[PDB]
Enzyme design. Sequence first.
Site, PDB file in Angstrom:
ATOM      1  CG  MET I  55      -5.931  45.240 -71.106  1.00 21.79           C
ATOM      2  SD  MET I  55      -3.888  45.535 -70.961  1.00 21.79           S
ATOM      3  CE  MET I  55      -3.424  45.380 -72.420  1.00 21.79           C
ATOM      4  CB  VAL I  58      -8.971  47.325 -67.587  1.00 20.25           C
ATOM      5  CG1 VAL I  58      -9.340  46.231 -66.298  1.00 20.25           C
ATOM      6  CG2 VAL I  58     -10.298  47.403 -68.371  1.00 20.25           C
ATOM      7  CG  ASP I  59      -3.651  47.282 -67.039  1.00 17.23           C
ATOM      8  OD1 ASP I  59      -3.447  48.472 -67.040  1.00 17.23           O
ATOM      9  OD2 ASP I  59      -3.168  46.541 -67.879  1.00 17.23           O
ATOM     10  CB  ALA I  60      -5.033  52.577 -65.005  1.00 18.02           C
ATOM     11  CG  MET I  63      -0.965  48.334 -63.829  1.00 19.87           C
ATOM     12  SD  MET I  63       0.612  47.117 -63.944  1.00 19.87           S
ATOM     13  CE  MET I  63       0.315  46.462 -65.335  1.00 19.87           C
TER      14      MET I  63
END
Lengths: 266, 52, 52, 101, 77, 77, 77, 77, 77, 77
Positions: I55, I58-60, I63
């Site tokens: 996780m 995934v969001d890096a 962001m």
Amino acid sequence: ENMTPQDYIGHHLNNLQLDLRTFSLVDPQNPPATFWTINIDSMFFSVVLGLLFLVLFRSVAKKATSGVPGKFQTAIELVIGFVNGSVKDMYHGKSKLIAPLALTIFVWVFLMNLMDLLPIDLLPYIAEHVLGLPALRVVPSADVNVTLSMALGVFILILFYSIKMKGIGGFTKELTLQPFNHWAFIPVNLILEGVSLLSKPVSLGLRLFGNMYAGELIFILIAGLLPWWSQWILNVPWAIFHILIITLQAFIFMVLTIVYLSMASE
Amino acid sequence: MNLNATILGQAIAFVLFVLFCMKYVWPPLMAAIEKRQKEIADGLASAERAHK
Amino acid sequence: MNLNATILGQAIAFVLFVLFCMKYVWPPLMAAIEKRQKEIADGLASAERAHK
Amino acid sequence: TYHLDVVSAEQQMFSGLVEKIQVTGSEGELGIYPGHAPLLTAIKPGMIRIVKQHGHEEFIYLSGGILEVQPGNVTVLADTAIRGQDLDEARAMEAKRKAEE
Amino acid sequence: NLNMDLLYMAAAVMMGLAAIGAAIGIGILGGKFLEGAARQPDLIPLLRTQFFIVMGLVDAIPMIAVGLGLYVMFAVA
Amino acid sequence: NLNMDLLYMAAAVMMGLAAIGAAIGIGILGGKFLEGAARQPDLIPLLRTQFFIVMGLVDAIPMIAVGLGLYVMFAVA
Amino acid sequence: NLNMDLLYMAAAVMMGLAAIGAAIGIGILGGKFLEGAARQPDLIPLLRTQFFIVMGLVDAIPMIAVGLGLYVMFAVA
Amino acid sequence: NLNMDLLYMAAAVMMGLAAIGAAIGIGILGGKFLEGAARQPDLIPLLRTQFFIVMGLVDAIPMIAVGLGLYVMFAVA
Amino acid sequence: NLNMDLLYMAAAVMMGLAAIGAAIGIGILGGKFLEGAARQPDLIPLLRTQFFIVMGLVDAIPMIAVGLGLYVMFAVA
Amino acid sequence: NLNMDLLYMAAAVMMGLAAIGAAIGIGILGGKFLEGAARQPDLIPLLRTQFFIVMGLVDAIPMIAVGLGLYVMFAVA
């Protein structure tokens, strides 16, 4: 000091380019235009971190003992076993180059990324005020020129191994004939296999720059925009995340170099 | 960003850190490790010979 | 904006980061080094059993 | 409706026509109804419970086994115990020493 | 002036669409590698070879598309 | 100004949509190769020879789209 | 207008599509890691190192568009 | 005469949407052939015949959009 | 001057698309955790550690896009 | 005038894509809950707990998007 935040964020993104012709420490108000303006900060910090790599490991390699190792010597042989165990996994040939190449890439690219953790104004302030240099930014791998210099360095290794270990006869077959096999497809295959070969190193260097640039710039934005009382609640959760990125981008540049040099010959 | 003469400068520093690491750092460390691993095998052999 | 204020906020954010590193990042390392000096000792003790 | 057997290598445990069962499958609890498509599973230790023709209610405890289903047929090949202990290898250990002594 | 200034929007379209194509294509292919690696784990250095065979085919078209996008920005514009 | 501009945009939509087609279509096809690779690994040299036939059809149509994209940028200008 | 505002619109398209591609491609790949890690829970160090091989290739091509998107805003505009 | 400039853009969107449909359709259809070949490999020249019977229908509408978009680009423009 | 309205549109495209990729990629990834936590419910402390490792990746890229959309609206616009 | 008007179009794309992200991503994550509850009904108070742990991560981004869409529509307007 007329720092608007849109300008504070500006000056931080300026490297110490200096022209060979004038030999002059340029500043962010006006950028000159020529190719020959070495980025002073990157070379100096890159070789100082690279020297600190070699000075530490030699200060152990010149003494390291097969008794119970000391508590410093054990931290060096853990990285040596990590690097050799990863080589031994993904490379079977006899070459004396791949193992130390894989070591220097890991430990140097790790040290370069580690600079991004330090407070963004600490070294740049000291260089302007104490020394008087017009600019500084202290992460070497957050600049393209070092990462393409390493990735093209490994590309010349990729060509040396594929020529050496299978010859121009074998290298000319694999570049023309695959992936469609029939000689009818050769004209198309020369485009596909040629660019795919270059796609491997270009992804290596621009992955490393892309992470590092967009992590240094986040500390520049959080520093530039938010008031001091509030920076820590967005800075601390990001430094804790980027400790993960500095390791993984050093580990992946190691791993893919091995995989590309290993799959080149065998 | 901007392509620069730094690309050649870093390529000198890169090769020379790989050459001094290849000669000096790596062979003396891995001789010292393998010299330990070898002795552990020698101890195991001695245990087999003793029993026999 | 105030420039020295940015350095103040960076200090607070570094101190809180150090205090996380000390309690969640460093002890896993001193665990690992210590548990690889445990392994070595057991093997050396096993060599003495081979010697006996 | 369908014809349920419950059997073991030692014995027939039950046979008769059945309107539905609840049976404890390998990955979760299961119910079988007339014409249910063919099905295979191991079954866990526990109850299988049954309604015979006229919906008469019957419960059988099973140590385990295999359930399978075919058009018109359900058969549960039950066995005496888990067998997964395999502590009966120890029972072969004295088979050796008593031969040597 | 709008001629070059739109070209940055032309390369943004071209290499952005390539970035969704290549990353999802390798994400599917790589998922069947790791599930293959958990069903037959004594087998990983065989399958990873195969993954690197077909990943060389997947990226070739996106990487010319990215390359031609980079060309429009740096060369043409 | 804006005739030469729009030609580069027309190549961006042409190569961008082709890079989605060629990348995703081999992602699906090459993942089904990998699962037949994992199920019967001694059979890989046979399926690979079927993968290269099928994969040639998949790209055949995206690669005349890419060829017209390079034509529109380099040749028409 | 037309110089600055389109360059932010170009960067928005580049780093938005890379957000689509690199997130979903690692969602697809990362789910097969967690399925394999539920099947063979002694393997997780072996599968996570395979996962780190594969995740490097997925992220590389979006990271071209992430770094160049930041170039367009900060260096160009 | 501005008319030429949009017709290259109108040919670009037919050949891009055709390249998506004709590449992902043959990727889904060909990937189920390869699992059919991994199960029953003595069947492969039976399944190739049905694959070529079915693959001609996936390419009915896309070879017309490639057909008319390649017309618009040359005959009409 | 009008220019400042496109800067909100540029942030809107960049920040909404990053909310597509950050939400679906965690949903795919998170549901595969729940499916394995249903299976092996004594391994919820271990799988939930792996979920935070993957996780985090995934969001890096989402962001960065959310961070640049806030910069565009508040700081630039 | 467009400095009022486009800001409602700029918020519609933020609160459209935030609504496709949060609804598909919770549907995929919530459906895997519902099968595991049907298979393992003893575990629902367990799985429901981890469903609410994991659901708060899916919404972290789409509530940035919808809070800025409300801010753009009413505060800047």
